[PDB]
Symmetry: D2
Subunit: 191 residues, 4 copies
């Protein structure tokens, strides 16, 4: 039976398992440290390709709304130019499930060479990106069916980036709320 | 207690409830019809703003990989120009949780005027977009905490678009698999 | 003397020379043929990276407004997935000054393998892209100063894409004017 | 006679006149001041829609390569969220030929309210954007034919942004050259 109802049920369970297995690997003390490192960055570059780039863009819009200076761009050659322009104290959040896309590895190498802090969000595998990162947060898609592998992967990745966002709101709550209110007031003027 | 572990646990449950409540509203017979309508479209425009635009882009990349001709662009004025260029038999997938963003409503009005079929992916509310759509698929975020409302909304929206994608693969399985293989072979050449 | 007034004067002359030298190479009979080929394409993919991707996007928005079904995306891995999904009769407009960016060459190889027609917009050099293209339109930046090389290159590239756009309007003038009017009416509703 | 050769000749002359008429309005002392203001900005937001957004993106990529922290995004609601997050000393470069697109005016109002410096790049008309800007740089398309109005407008706009870029390179030449070299070395590794 391959009805749409069966497909939906199996996909929801697949996503639940990705959330659970990703959450199970978190070191919460290490996560609080990473959040503090991000909060101090004068500039944050979020890198990625394909589905990882969309996860990165999703995080980037939220961070920009609450006042962070963020670079996040799909063009891989532009991404490389930003990575080499990073400074000590800046942060790169490198989102790559495989950790082995040449463009993203190159951006991480360039960021690290400039003295920036590299935080990888990547699968539980021994990848070039994991070897370059100062800190790694793990994303586990679980055992997925081929038609939905990319969707459960994205679900797992968003569980990590979403938690980073909430942690950053927690650290600067008053200003975050002020910026959320100003943003809502502005977009309502476009109704 | 507002520790990161508590936050992660509550957020995962919030997402689970969004998946469940969205799934509970599906009319599977109506969904199969919508999938067939999409499969026949010579051109598909996926519209949206903000987080909905990212959900749309996520679907657009998958549909393009399996051979669909898709327009999906963030610039709202460009979106309007595409909507008025649609033809009878083309499909607009209008993604808007509120269903009341002026730009997205305008695009749906323009598409409908040209004779295109409008499928709305929207919250369970009485919005201008829902009144313009030929078919509506409901997305329910559930009762969310303010720090994560947009994330659970996105989770609910992706549950609908992901199901559309799997349904479309199901309808043209051989060609979808061929295109997935060619795509994987090409990107591996960029390693 | 390196005053801003001197810089502006020299840059305008550099752009004038790029327009002139690019125009001087055009075979107008071959250009009319290319325009006809584009006009018949059920789907057009415009590829490119960096500055060439922006030139491509600029053309893509105009073509979409006048009714063409166009793919144009910065992410190089997404571009590859679109190229392998092209069909016989579809057209790829491959914009690359060097003609030797691996990602763009790969997209042209994939498009040609599927039977699509490849039109390269590229410098007057013996590049892999020029060897893969069914038709090539030349772009000459001229001898440029290092601070403005990319700007005069873009000027030369836009001179070719702009001419393609005008030629396509010429071929379907009534419908183009109708679509321009509908588009203007819609965007004015967002004032 | 409406041959492609005649069209190309007329379009090149139209672009030459746009460059000339835009250049003729520059106050070079005021321009040097604007360049200095930009050079000191901890964060720069470049706003715009449609063709102006592409001009902005073109400038943004160059500024990011030479070390500036820049926001530049097509989604108008995201643009609004960035504008309200700007700080005193930050700069908004608001690119709008008409100066009367509601979204761009709103972003300029929000930036000014936060204490940021607003530099408008706009036509020689009495627009809401010109009334909000601390400094305005004029862009003149000249008298254009309807098929090419947007192209000559873009040419005029790029003449201003290109001059800003060269002026900024001039102010920090050693670091700009270092960043250009690192960027070229990195992208060559992707060949
Ligand atoms: C054809 C292919 O395989 N494209 C992949 C992307 O997969 C997408 C979801 C897909 O399957 O259509 C992947 O998101 C991206 C980043 O991958 P990663 O850095 O997250 O490991 O790389 C690309 O080559
Ligand atoms: C400041 C604001 O409210 N921006 C909203 C977007 O919310 C985002 C996630 C946010 O909160 O930062 C919303 O995704 C978009 C489409 O909304 P919708 O069409 O899905 O209802 O509209 C925008 O105005
Ligand atoms: C650091 C570098 O060199 N980036 C280049 C891009 O140059 C841009 C304008 C630049 O200088 O910052 C180039 O537009 C793109 C496509 O090049 P092409 O396909 O048009 O030849 O390739 C990228 O690697
Ligand atoms: C249908 C329409 O008119 N779209 C316009 C855009 O024109 C484009 C080039 C076009 O004609 O297709 C314009 O670039 C943008 C910003 O305009 P501006 O802020 O530079 O004045 O506004 C949009 O509404």
């Amino acid at each position: 039976d391959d009805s749409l109802e069966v497909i939906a049920r199996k996909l929801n369970r697949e996503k639940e398992l990705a959330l659970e297995q990703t959450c199970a690997l978190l070191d919460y003390a290490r996560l609080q440290k990473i959040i503090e490192v991000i909060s101090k960055a004068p500039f944050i570059q979020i890198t990625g390709l394909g589905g990882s780039a969309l996860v990165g863009r999703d995080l980037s819009f939220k961070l920009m709304k609450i006042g962070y200076r963020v670079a996040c761009e799909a063009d891989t050659h532009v991404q490389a130019t930003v990575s080499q322009a990073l400074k000590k104290g800046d942060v790169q959040i490198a989102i790559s499930y495989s950790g082995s896309k040449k463009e993203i590895v190159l951006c991480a190498e360039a960021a690290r060479k400039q003295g920036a802090t590299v935080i990888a969000i990547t699968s539980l595998t021994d990848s070039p990106l994991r070897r370059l990162a100062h800190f790694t947060l793990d994303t586990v898609s679980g055992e997925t069916e081929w038609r939905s592998s990319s969707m459960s992967t994205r679900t797992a990745q968003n569980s990590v980036t979403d938690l980073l966002f909430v942690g950053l709101v927690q650290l600067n709550d008053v200003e975050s709320l002020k910026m959320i209110q100003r943003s809502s007031e502005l977009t309502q003027r476009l109704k």
